[PDB]
């Protein structure tokens, strides 16, 4: 499915990534807030599992 298309569709992606990837992402708010989501995340593994206990 090449029709020559996608060079504008790189131009996108390349900033929204840049904005996670570089400044202006703020992580101080990942160390205060990390404490819950990261709590869930380590529950999640069992969640695939479908056990819980």
Sequence with gaps: ALFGLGVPELAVIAGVAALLFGPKKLPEIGKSIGKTVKSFQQAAKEF????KT
């Design 48 to 51: 695939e599992s479908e056990l």
